Amino acid sequence: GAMAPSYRVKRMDIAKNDEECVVNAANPRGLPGDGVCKAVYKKWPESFKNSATPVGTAKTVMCGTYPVIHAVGPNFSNYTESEGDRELAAAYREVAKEVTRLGVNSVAIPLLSTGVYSGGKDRLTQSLNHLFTAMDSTDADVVIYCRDKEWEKKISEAIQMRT
Ligand SMILES: [Cl-]
Ligand SMILES: [Cl-]
Ligand SMILES: [Cl-]
């Protein structure tokens, strides 16, 4: 565990993280994909051997000794708001299980279903709150990665609102 487990946010490519493992915003078929998933494919391609896993689940594959946790959030273009919300919560619960099992002291995590799986809606708060629900009972240092300047401010404010 971390000595004083924390939440932080950084605005940069998750492929350049300084944590002991990474969560991929994966597709269910283990394809290279786009966005976070393509950056992860370019950085850790070995981790996509048998990474295919259903929506709402997480599957870890080692790149050397570095764990890549493939977490499959729902595509809100296909799911109802209700079913998508349930699967998005489930995917983060499976990330907390894997982080715990691996015994890491830190993890880099993107906000699942907020990019091309968002169904064209702003899901910062919905996705972040499911991340907190899952990760709050873990003792890893969590570092959230984003790319947008206003998202960085809103994520930083939500973290600070606790503490
Ligand atoms: Cl960068
Ligand atoms: Cl996405
Ligand atoms: Cl972002």
Domain ranges of the chain: 1-163
Helices (H), 103-148: 124-135
Question: How many whole angstroms from 16 Cα to the centroid of ligand 1?
Answer: 7
Task: Kindly state the tokens that stand for 48.
Answer: 């996509």
- Exp. method: X-ray
**Annotated binding-site residue? 30:** no
Alpha helices of 49-148 — where are they, by DSSP H? 81-102, 124-135
Closest CA to 110 of 127, 90, 88: 127
- Among all bound ligands, the one having the nearest atom to the CA of 25 is 2
State in Å: Cα 55 to ligand 3 middle.
21
Task: Tell me how far CA of residue 39 lies from CA of 26, 150, 153, in angstroms.
Answer: 11, 22, 23
105 with 5: CB under 8 angstroms? no
7-11 and 66-71 strand pairing = unpaired
**Residue 145 β-bridge partners:** 10, 110
Q: What separation in Å is there between the alpha carbon of 12 and the centre of ligand 1?
A: 4
Q: Which value in Å is the resolution of this experimental model?
A: 1.5
Beta strand 141-146 with 106-110 is parallel
- Ligand 2 centre and the CA of 128: distance in Å? 13
- Tokens representing 150 are 């206003």
